[PDB]
Amino acid sequence: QMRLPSADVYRFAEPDSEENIIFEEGIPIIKAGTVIKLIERLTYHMYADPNFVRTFLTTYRSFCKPQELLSLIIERFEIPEPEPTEADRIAIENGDQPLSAELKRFRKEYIQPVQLRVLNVCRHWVEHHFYDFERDAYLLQRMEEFIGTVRGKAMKKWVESITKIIQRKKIANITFQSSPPTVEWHISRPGHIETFDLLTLHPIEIARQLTLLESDLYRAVQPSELVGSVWTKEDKEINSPNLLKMIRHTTNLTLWFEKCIVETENLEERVAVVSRIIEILQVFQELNNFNGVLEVVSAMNSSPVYRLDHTFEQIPSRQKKILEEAHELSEDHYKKYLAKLRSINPPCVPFFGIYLTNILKTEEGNPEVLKRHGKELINFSKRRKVAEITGEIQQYQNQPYCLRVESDIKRFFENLNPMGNSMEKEFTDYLFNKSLEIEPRNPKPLPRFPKKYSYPLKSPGVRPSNPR
Amino acid sequence: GMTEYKLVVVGAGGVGKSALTIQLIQNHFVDEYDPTIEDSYRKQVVIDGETCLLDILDTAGQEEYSAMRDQYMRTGEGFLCVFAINNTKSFEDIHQYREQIKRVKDSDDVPMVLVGNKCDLAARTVESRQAQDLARSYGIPYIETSAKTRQGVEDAFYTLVREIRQH
Amino acid sequence: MTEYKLVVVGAGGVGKSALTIQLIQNHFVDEYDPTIEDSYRKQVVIDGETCLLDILDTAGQEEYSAMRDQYMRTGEGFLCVFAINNTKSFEDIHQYREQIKRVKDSDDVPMVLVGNKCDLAARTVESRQAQDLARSYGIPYIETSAKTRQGVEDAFYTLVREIRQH
Ligand SMILES: Nc1nc2c(ncn2[C@@H]2O[C@H](COP(=O)(O)OP(=O)(O)NP(=O)(O)O)[C@@H](O)[C@H]2O)c(=O)[nH]1
Ligand SMILES: Fc1ccc(Nc2c3c(nc4cc(Cl)ccc24)CCCC3)cc1
Numbered sequence: 001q002m003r004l005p006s007a008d009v010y011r012f013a014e015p016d017s018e019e020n021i022i023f024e025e026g027i028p029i030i031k032a033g034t035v036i037k038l039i040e041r042l043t044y045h046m047y048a049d050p051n052f053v054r055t056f057l058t059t060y061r062s063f064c065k066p067q068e069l070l071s072l073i074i075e076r077f078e079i080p081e082p083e084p085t086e087a088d089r090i091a092i093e094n095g096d097q098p099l100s101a102e103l104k105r106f107r108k109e110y111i112q113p114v115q116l117r118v119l120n121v122c123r124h125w126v127e128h129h130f131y132d133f134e135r136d137a138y139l140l141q142r143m144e145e146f147i148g149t150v151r152g153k154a155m156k157k158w159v160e161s162i163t164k165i166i167q168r169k170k171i172a173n174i175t176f177q178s179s180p181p182t183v184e185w186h187i188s189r190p191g192h193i194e195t196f197d198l199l200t201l202h203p204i205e206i207a208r209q210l211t212l213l214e215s216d217l218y219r220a221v222q223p224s225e226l227v228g229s230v231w232t233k234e235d236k237e238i239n240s241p242n243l244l245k246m247i248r249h250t251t252n253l254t255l256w257f258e259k260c261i262v263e264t265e266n267l268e269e270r271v272a273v274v275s276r277i278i279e280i281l282q283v284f285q286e287l288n289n290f291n292g293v294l295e296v297v298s299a300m301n302s303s304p305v306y307r308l309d310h311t312f313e314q315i316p317s318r319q320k321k322i323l324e325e326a327h328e329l330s331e332d333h334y335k336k337y338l339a340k341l342r343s344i345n346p347p348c349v350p351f352f353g354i355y356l357t358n359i360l361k362t363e364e365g366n367p368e369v370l371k372r373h374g375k376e377l378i379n380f381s382k383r384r385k386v387a388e389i390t391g392e393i394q395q396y397q398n399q400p401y402c403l404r405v406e407s408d409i410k411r412f413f414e415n416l417n418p419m420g421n422s423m424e425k426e427f428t429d430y431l432f433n434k435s436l437e438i439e440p441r442n443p444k445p446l447p448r449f450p451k452k453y454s455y456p457l458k459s460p461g462v463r464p465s466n467p468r
Numbered sequence: 469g470m471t472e473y474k475l476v477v478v479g480a481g482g483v484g485k486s487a488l489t490i491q492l493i494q495n496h497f498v499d500e501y502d503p504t505i506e507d508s509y510r511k512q513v514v515i516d517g518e519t520c521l522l523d524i525l526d527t528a529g530q531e532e533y534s535a536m537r538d539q540y541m542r543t544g545e546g547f548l549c550v551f552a553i554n555n556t557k558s559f560e561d562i563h564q565y566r567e568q569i570k571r572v573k574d575s576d577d578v579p580m581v582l583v584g585n586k587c588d589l590a591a592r593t594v595e596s597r598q599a600q601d602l603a604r605s606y607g608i609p610y611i612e613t614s615a616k617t618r619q620g621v622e623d624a625f626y627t628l629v630r631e632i633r634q635h
Numbered sequence: 636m637t638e639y640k641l642v643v644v645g646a647g648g649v650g651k652s653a654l655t656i657q658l659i660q661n662h663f664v665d666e667y668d669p670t671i672e673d674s675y676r677k678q679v680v681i682d683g684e685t686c687l688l689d690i691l692d693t694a695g696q697e698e699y700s701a702m703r704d705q706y707m708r709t710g711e712g713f714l715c716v717f718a719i720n721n722t723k724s725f726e727d728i729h730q731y732r733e734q735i736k737r738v739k740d741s742d743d744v745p746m747v748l749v750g751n752k753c754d755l756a757a758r759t760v761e762s763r764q765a766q767d768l769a770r771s772y773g774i775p776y777i778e779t780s781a782k783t784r785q786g787v788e789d790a791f792y793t794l795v796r797e798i799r800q801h
């Protein structure tokens with residue numbers, strides 16, 4: 001086994017002990033450790049652990065400041081070389097070239113792997129966690145300086161590369177093989193944005209354009225918006241803007257469905273509206289847009305809608321089944337949803353809510369440190385659990401949908417604002433009062449209402465068409 | 469088998485709400501948690517000599533999904549309405565939560581408890597007398613809990629189960 | 636779902652990262668940023684079964700050649716990549732083959748031989764030559780382009796099939 005520098009001149013050569021590192025019960029998994037030990041293992045000479053690199057860079061800010069992390073990995077990089085051995089000494093004394101076997105081995109098997117792995121931490125940091133540098137220009141200057149002054153030919157290719165990557169990141173296209181399906185139109189024709197509405201757009205294309213929108217919103221959320229539970233705290237609009245934009249879209253679409261339903265006072269027309277929404281749900285299911293599916297399910301379970309017994313009675317049996325099957329995804333703490341998500345072929349759009357709850361509970365329910373033998377050790381198992389969730393999120397963010405954007409339909413849904421200028425309580429009270437109006441509580445009799453739609457209510461259905 | 473109670477936790481986000489159910493379900497003498505496993509929200513307990521199963525829904529973290537509240541609430545037979553004793557806004561939110569529960573359950577008399585949660589050492593801004601008066605005006609029990617010492621946690625859940633049993 | 640540990644190996648610049656990123660993100664990387672070690676995950680249905688692919692993207696630069704044992708130990712299957720316009724990368728293949736066999740102490744390791752950059756006209760390694768090598772290894776040979784996606788899914792999912800039946 002290679003000898004190491006003295007722990008007095010190089011801190012990362014301290015022996016492992018239960019006072020500085022604890023492993024879980026073919027590489028070890030770390031339960032807890034000092035920052036020094038975490039960084040040592042992050043950049044270990046014996047093996048690479050790219051997933052540890054992601055986990056660490058995603059979560060470290062809860063136990064180490066960015067400026068200190070940089071200082072520590074630069075410290076890690078600066079490894080002293082051993083002095084010549086007795087055999088080397090004797091060769092030199094006789095005017096011969098020493099073999100320097102121990103020195104050469106230590107360079108090849110300790111220094112070069114550790115230094116390369118430090119540079120890999122730098123590379124990942126810059127490529128996938130650049131926000132530290134966007135938010136702290138001095139940190140970026142220090143990184144550029146460190147990388148830009150690494151000498152020696154062994155590291156040269158990567159140092160020159162990382163320098164370029166940093167410069168690119170400072171100032172900052174999909175292939176499919178198969179073409180996307182043709183955009184489908186119903187009553188509203190291309191360019192006639194004024195007529196766009198729930199029933200006049202093609203239900204297939206409604207689901208497609210909402211899926212593109214919801215996929216983009218899903219794909220835009222960074223782990224920085226999630227770690228430390230920052231989307232729940234006072235500065236959530238600052239720290240979690242993409243997440244909140246995504247959730248507000250989901251909320252608005254749910255409210256829009258409810259509004260379309262209860263503002264359709266005529267029972268027959270309202271049935272057509274609810275049926276159309278269920279067809280949209282069916283296309284969401286086909287597209288693996290689970291966010292879309294739950295948008296619809298949430299609307300149908302809402303207080304104003306759920307109570308519409310006369311409407312529900314007239315929903316065709318085949319659609320009741322579709323809706324019920326969707327609802328069962330969410331039952332028993334999303335048991336069937338979680339199984340389905342893990343079985344489909346992406347692209348998909350997950351429901352984000354479960355991830356948020358599991359991240360929050362993981363953070364709240366586990367201690368920051370473990371106390372052992374008088375020492376405080378960073379509880380890394382807690383951070384690994386958070387990173388497993390952010391990792392799953394990221395895995396579903398890679399695959400793009402093979403669907404063509406329709407700019408006008410996209411804009412229509414981007415600008416949807418069912419609440420208008422009303423506050424939430426006022427609006428949702430309004431929805432419930434509309435519900436009471438159109439289908440009064442027993443034993444009040446059911447009134448009749450005039451029709452509001454001048455165009456045909458018959459759906460074009462949700463099977464796609466294909467001209468030559 | 470034994471009776472299973474579907475309990476739902478509601479209240480403002482960002483103020484330690486999740487600690488209540490975590491402390492209940494938790495190992496109890498090891499401070500840790502994996503919410504991704506089913507053991508994390510189902511719990512067998514003995515209340516007044518009668519064994520039962522608690523199923524707890526706490527969607528802490530999903531507060532911004534405001535249009536999903538009805539759907540989540542619909543699943544429950546009993547409700548813990550939680551505010552933080554150092555956050556007056558969360559306390560003021562309670563009225564609308566209660567109104568929303570009554571609407572979703574279509575009932576004026578839904579089993580529920582008001583819970584004042586002490587989530588940190590910051591200054592209290594809601595006095596216990598304020599919260600008692602509010603709970604009394606609603607005709608429901610009030611329980612105060614600590615997010616750190618587990619004090620009051622069993623009381624909150626057991627009291628709610630008694631409200632369900634005596635409905 | 637079963638998890639599969641895939642490892643992509645081969646000389647520097649043959650397109651290991653471009654292949655991987657094309658598979659993961661459907662995007663072609665034009666830049667040449669020498670890898671140290673990267674890891675990717677992909678849930679995908681293959682022959683009707685949902686798989687979770689763990690893909691290790693390794694360093695081709697010679698300066699990293701002393702650090703291969705550690706990833707060869709963990710890998711369940713290997714994509715051995717050369718570029719069809721680079722004869723030296725083809726000659727480098729047998730070195731990877733031998734090291735993998737040594738590390739895992741096995742003559743029966745799931746592998747696929749990949750001839751990348753088949754979008755380029757200026758070929759210097761003939762398909763027959765690579766096919767002959769592949770047959771001597773008892774493994775399939777698939778030509779690919781990370782740029783156009785030609786063969787990319789075939790190469791990776793063929794490797795999954797070999798692990799599955801190992
Ligand atoms: N025309 C063409 N160029 C390709 C193809 N694959 C990769 N390239 C180009 O070849 C260069 C090297 O690609 P890269 O993926 O970085 O190779 P690598 O094998 O990962 N290199 P390293 O071993 O150092 O990490 C890049 O400029 C890339 O765009 C391909 O199929 N066709
Ligand atoms: F996610 C879902 C899945 C199924 C349902 N089922 C419905 C039920 C009732 N009314 C409904 C009214 C409408 Cl307009 C739609 C669905 C309704 C009352 C009887 C019980 C169930 C709701 C939400």
Ligand SMILES: [Mg+2]
Nearest residue numbers: 651652669670
């Ligand atoms: Mg590479």
